Design an enzyme around this catalytic site. Structure first.
Site, PDB file in Angstrom:
ATOM      1  N   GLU A  41     -24.012  39.027  -2.269  1.00  0.00           N
ATOM      2  CA  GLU A  41     -25.017  38.087  -3.014  1.00  0.00           C
ATOM      3  C   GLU A  41     -25.945  37.475  -2.261  1.00  0.00           C
ATOM      4  OE1 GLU A  41     -25.516  39.650  -6.226  1.00  0.00           O
ATOM      5  OE2 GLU A  41     -23.359  40.674  -7.035  1.00  0.00           O
TER       6      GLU A  41
ATOM      7  N   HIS B 252     -27.526  41.986  -3.194  1.00  0.00           N
ATOM      8  CA  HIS B 252     -28.363  41.745  -4.314  1.00  0.00           C
ATOM      9  C   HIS B 252     -29.130  42.842  -4.675  1.00  0.00           C
ATOM     10  CE1 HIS B 252     -28.563  39.060  -7.574  1.00  0.00           C
ATOM     11  NE2 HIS B 252     -29.835  38.991  -7.965  1.00  0.00           N
TER      12      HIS B 252
ATOM     13  N   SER C  26     -28.646  40.571 -12.880  1.00  0.00           N
ATOM     14  CA  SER C  26     -29.365  39.708 -12.339  1.00  0.00           C
ATOM     15  C   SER C  26     -29.740  38.424 -13.497  1.00  0.00           C
ATOM     16  CB  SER C  26     -30.394  39.326 -11.395  1.00  0.00           C
ATOM     17  OG  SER C  26     -31.101  38.076 -10.401  1.00  0.00           O
TER      18      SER C  26
HETATM   19  N1  LIG Z   1     -37.476  32.327  -7.112  1.00  0.00           N
HETATM   20  C1  LIG Z   1     -38.889  33.062  -7.223  1.00  0.00           C
HETATM   21  C2  LIG Z   1     -38.100  33.267  -9.179  1.00  0.00           C
HETATM   22  C3  LIG Z   1     -36.697  33.593  -8.687  1.00  0.00           C
HETATM   23  C4  LIG Z   1     -35.424  33.218  -8.752  1.00  0.00           C
HETATM   24  N2  LIG Z   1     -34.631  33.808  -8.893  1.00  0.00           N
HETATM   25  C5  LIG Z   1     -34.678  35.446  -7.900  1.00  0.00           C
HETATM   26  C6  LIG Z   1     -33.768  36.732  -8.152  1.00  0.00           C
HETATM   27  C7  LIG Z   1     -34.810  37.808  -7.778  1.00  0.00           C
HETATM   28  C8  LIG Z   1     -36.107  37.503  -8.114  1.00  0.00           C
HETATM   29  C9  LIG Z   1     -37.432  36.475  -8.150  1.00  0.00           C
HETATM   30  C10 LIG Z   1     -36.197  35.507  -8.088  1.00  0.00           C
HETATM   31  C11 LIG Z   1     -39.205  34.409  -6.778  1.00  0.00           C
HETATM   32  O1  LIG Z   1     -39.512  34.998  -7.495  1.00  0.00           O
HETATM   33  N3  LIG Z   1     -39.339  34.434  -5.436  1.00  0.00           N
HETATM   34  C12 LIG Z   1     -38.884  33.651  -4.676  1.00  0.00           C
HETATM   35  C13 LIG Z   1     -37.020  34.801  -3.923  1.00  0.00           C
HETATM   36  C14 LIG Z   1     -37.503  36.480  -3.554  1.00  0.00           C
HETATM   37  C15 LIG Z   1     -36.600  37.357  -4.211  1.00  0.00           C
HETATM   38  C16 LIG Z   1     -37.430  38.887  -4.451  1.00  0.00           C
HETATM   39  C17 LIG Z   1     -37.657  39.836  -5.663  1.00  0.00           C
HETATM   40  N4  LIG Z   1     -36.878  40.875  -4.883  1.00  0.00           N
HETATM   41  C18 LIG Z   1     -35.226  41.320  -4.853  1.00  0.00           C
HETATM   42  C19 LIG Z   1     -34.917  41.593  -5.843  1.00  0.00           C
HETATM   43  C20 LIG Z   1     -34.047  41.488  -6.015  1.00  0.00           C
HETATM   44  N5  LIG Z   1     -32.808  42.279  -4.997  1.00  0.00           N
HETATM   45  C21 LIG Z   1     -34.216  42.355  -3.755  1.00  0.00           C
HETATM   46  C22 LIG Z   1     -33.396  41.955  -2.264  1.00  0.00           C
HETATM   47  C23 LIG Z   1     -33.393  41.712  -1.455  1.00  0.00           C
HETATM   48 CL1  LIG Z   1     -32.914  41.923   0.222  1.00  0.00          CL
HETATM   49  C24 LIG Z   1     -34.551  41.072  -1.212  1.00  0.00           C
HETATM   50  C25 LIG Z   1     -35.304  41.275  -2.962  1.00  0.00           C
HETATM   51  C26 LIG Z   1     -34.800  40.983  -3.606  1.00  0.00           C
HETATM   52  C27 LIG Z   1     -32.467  41.890  -7.918  1.00  0.00           C
HETATM   53  C28 LIG Z   1     -33.096  41.569  -8.849  1.00  0.00           C
HETATM   54  C29 LIG Z   1     -34.626  42.224  -8.791  1.00  0.00           C
HETATM   55  C30 LIG Z   1     -35.691  41.450  -7.634  1.00  0.00           C
END
Ligand SMILES: N[C@H](Cc1c[nH]c2ccccc12)C(=O)NCCCCCCNc1c2c(nc3cc(Cl)ccc13)CCCC2
Ligand SMILES: *[C@@H]1O[C@H](CO[C@@H]2O[C@@H](C)[C@@H](O)[C@@H](O)[C@@H]2O)[C@@H](O[C@@H]2O[C@H](CO)[C@@H](O)[C@H](O)[C@H]2NC(C)=O)[C@H](O)[C@H]1NC(C)=O
Ligand SMILES: *[C@@H]1O[C@H](CO[C@@H]2O[C@@H](C)[C@@H](O)[C@@H](O)[C@@H]2O)[C@@H](O[C@@H]2O[C@H](CO)[C@@H](O)[C@H](O)[C@H]2NC(C)=O)[C@H](O)[C@H]1NC(C)=O
Ligand SMILES: *[C@@H]1O[C@H](CO[C@@H]2O[C@@H](C)[C@@H](O)[C@@H](O)[C@@H]2O)[C@@H](O)[C@H](O)[C@H]1NC(C)=O
Ligand SMILES: *[C@@H]1O[C@H](CO)[C@@H](O)[C@H](O)[C@H]1NC(C)=O
Ligand SMILES: *[C@@H]1O[C@H](CO)[C@@H](O)[C@H](O)[C@H]1NC(C)=O
Ligand SMILES: *[C@@H]1O[C@H](CO)[C@@H](O)[C@H](O)[C@H]1NC(C)=O
Ligand code: NA
Length: 526
Positions: free
Chosen positions: A322, A435, A195
């Site tokens: 993704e 993802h 990512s």
């Molecule tokens: N939008 C902002 C900033 C942001 C932009 N793009 C992102 C991508 C990842 C994390 C944060 C961001 C934010 O922090 N939260 C809102 C979206 C919710 C995302 C939760 C984070 N947990 C997950 C991660 C990953 N896989 C996931 C799979 C699923 Cl099913 C659920 C949560 C996931 C892979 C990389 C590590 C993080």
């Protein structure tokens, strides 16, 4: 059990894995803690110590917003930090084989998290299996995320931008000066990340300051040409001044706004980060990499186009679904707790959430490319399309574009397509191969068979681990022993890629070709 480094001695601990032993050094500081006068500035070199630093437990994570859309759900809390948050968070970890190797290839992990979130101490980044099974050395580091890591007033050294990238780079340099003491080979270093981590690795390919700190690179669902990956300098300072007013720090001496932002307390900064953008998205990167003329000397789309990057082998790939992960974080009609069959109008409304500043014609163009069905009456049509829409635009096409353009300058490139849905997963099946859920396979967690993983998963993981290690050690991600299908190099013409799953490992051609012509040529113009 004690190692001597350029700045002092460090005590580690011993771990038992698979009837063998790995030596772990958790929490080695690699920079002056960026407190006080130092908040928002580039990391400063660490002044030596005389004691024995005890690196026996993960250090603090950098301050960040946890997301709380699913309290108590492991499917989401597995990603939240598992250690105290603190501004004092510039630390790294080292897993070395036992007994101490002589000239081991080194793998350096960089976590993702939208550049706002993430930490090296996550369970699914435990480097002890890679140390044990392939006798490489694994290093991960924490770098500042969110505004404390990427706030930007360009040219102004009190808030230059890309501080988190300079955090990474300073850890990479720590490995150069120090990993020989641990039995590692500084001339054999593979960056890998996922990512925003993968986008970080891609920017390290472009940044002259890192040219000499690693050999090869692996990009997992992420590259700098992705739409979320670089924030403009237009947007960046619009964003730091909106943060200024929300905290009562708007001044006109641009540097004394920064002085004013340094007396706020971390959580005050964190609360306001979310609103400096008018319309937000689950994928929105409020504070990201910027063309700072220091780490990044020009717009990366141009450096990529004109061959201005480190020449070496890259390993690149993406997951089949993704996009789905983000649909349950905002999209209407979507929930992890039902099959989220949505309607044509819910799809339409879901585009305005993921493509907010985009013209009415733009959103019609997307719907037109993704909604001419092989069957008009499958109820899950619009659910699958919006997933595909978000994945193709945000991850799959940028990754393919990056690989084509990189390969056009003569270096070997290898592209993969991870399409295995794990049996354990806590998320429903309509979300597919999501993802970040290849990470555990790369790290060898299915090797510790234990409760979660089918033996078929153990085998897939064992093979991926070998291909990754061979890529790190030798620039060629083959498994040569167990009559495995060979992994062809990706060339601009035939665009061959490899699929990874528990059943069929197959060579295919031209991933998402028709979808990606829309995203990479037509859509940038709207
Ligand atoms: N939008 C902002 C900033 C942001 C932009 N793009 C992102 C991508 C990842 C994390 C944060 C961001 C934010 O922090 N939260 C809102 C979206 C919710 C995302 C939760 C984070 N947990 C997950 C991660 C990953 N896989 C996931 C799979 C699923 Cl099913 C659920 C949560 C996931 C892979 C990389 C590590 C993080
Ligand atoms: C650049 O920033 C301005 C100002 O942002 C507003 O003020 C911040 C403190 C924060 O509260 C934000 O949520 C605000 O939006 C943007 O101008 C605003 O535009 C939006 C609508 O798009 C709306 O809130 C207001 O009408 C505007 N506010 C002001 C003070 O004019 C502007 O759109 C941002 N982007 C660009 C490209 O300039
Ligand atoms: C799938 O679920 C969503 C919402 O899930 C639950 O339903 C709510 C009543 C509430 O208890 C939430 O906290 C739950 O998570 C459904 O979306 C809702 O649909 C109806 C339509 O009138 C309505 O309650 C809301 O407008 C919608 N909520 C949204 C969009 O957030 C959706 O209908 C479900 N679909 C299927 C096929 O089960
Ligand atoms: C550093 O650690 C020394 C030895 O600690 C040993 O390992 C830990 C994990 C415990 O099991 C402990 O009982 C062991 O003796 C300490 O003697 C020393 O005081 C520590 N130094 C600091 C500054 O904490
Ligand atoms: C490790 O390998 C490099 C080349 O990859 C070599 O130059 C170096 O001397 C080796 N160091 C050892 C064997 O300690
Ligand atoms: C105020 O702004 C000037 C430039 O206009 C700058 O040189 C000066 O350092 C600023 N004040 C302080 C206290 O830094
Ligand atoms: C190759 O197959 C053997 C079983 O014959 C297995 O034990 C081993 O782990 C496999 N190696 C790799 C790298 O997949
Ligand atoms: Na551990």
């Amino acid at each position: 059990i004690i190692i001597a480094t350029k700045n002092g001695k460090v005590r580690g601990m011993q771990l038992t894995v698979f009837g063998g032993t790995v030596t772990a050094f958790l929490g080695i500081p690699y920079a002056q803690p960026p407190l006080g006068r130092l908040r928002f500035k580039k990391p400063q070199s660490l002044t030596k110590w005389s004691d024995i630093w005890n690196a026996t437990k993960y250090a603090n994570s950098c301050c960040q917003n946890i997301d709380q859309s699913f309290p108590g759900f492991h499917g989401s809390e597995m990603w939240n930090p598992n250690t105290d948050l603190s501004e004092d968070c510039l630390y790294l970890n080292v897993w070395i084989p036992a007994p101490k190797p002589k000239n081991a290839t080194v793998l350096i992990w960089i976590y993702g998290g939208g550049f706002q979130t993430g930490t090296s101490s996550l369970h699914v980044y435990d480097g002890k299996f890679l140390a044990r099974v392939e006798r490489v050395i694994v290093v991960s580091m924490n770098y500042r995320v969110g505004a404390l890591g990427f706030l930007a007033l360009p040219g102004n050294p009190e808030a230059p931008g890309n501080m988190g990238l300079f955090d990474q780079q300073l850890a990479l340099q720590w490995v150069q000066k120090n990993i020989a003491a641990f039995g590692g080979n500084p001339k054999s270093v593979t960056l890998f990340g996922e990512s925003a981590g993968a986008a970080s690795v891609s920017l390290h390919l472009l940044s002259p300051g890192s040219h000499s700190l690693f050999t090869r690179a692996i990009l997992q669902s992420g590259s700098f040409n992705a739409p979320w990956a670089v924030t403009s300098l237009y947007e960046a300072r619009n964003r730091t001044l909106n943060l200024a007013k929300l905290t009562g720090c708007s001044r006109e001496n641009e540097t004394e706004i920064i002085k004013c932002l340094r007396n706020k307390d971390p959580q005050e900064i964190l609360l306001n980060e979310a609103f400096v953008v008018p319309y937000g998205t689950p994928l929105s990167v409020n504070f990201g990499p910027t063309v700072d003329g220091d780490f990044l000397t020009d717009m990366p789309d141009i450096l990529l186009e004109l061959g201005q990057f480190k020449k070496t082998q890259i390993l690149v790939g993406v997951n089949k679904d993704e996009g789905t992960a983000f649909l349950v974080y905002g999209a209407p009609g979507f929930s992890k707790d039902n099959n989220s069959i949505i309607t044509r109008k819910e799809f339409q409304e879901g585009l305005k959430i993921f493509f907010p500043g985009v013209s009415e014609f733009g959103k019609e163009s997307i719907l037109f490319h993704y909604t001419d069905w092989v069957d008009d009456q499958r109820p899950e049509n619009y659910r699958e399309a919006l997933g595909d829409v978000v994945g193709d635009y945000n991850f799959i096409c940028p990754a393919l574009e990056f690989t084509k353009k990189f390969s056009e300058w003569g270096n070997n490139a290898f592209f993969y397509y991870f399409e295995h849905r794990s049996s354990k997963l806590p998320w429903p099946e309509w979300m597919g191969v999501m993802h970040g859920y290849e990470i555990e396979f790369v790290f060898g967690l299915p090797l510790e068979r234990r409760d979660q993983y089918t033996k078929a998963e153990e085998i897939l993981s064992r093979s991926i681990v070998k291909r990754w290690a061979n890529f790190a050690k030798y620039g060629n991600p083959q498994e040569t022993q167990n009559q495995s299908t060979s992994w062809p190099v990706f060339k601009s013409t035939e665009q061959k890629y490899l699929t990874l799953n528990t059943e069929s490992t197959r060579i295919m051609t031209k991933l998402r070709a028709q979808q990606c012509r829309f995203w990479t040529s037509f859509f940038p113009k709207v």
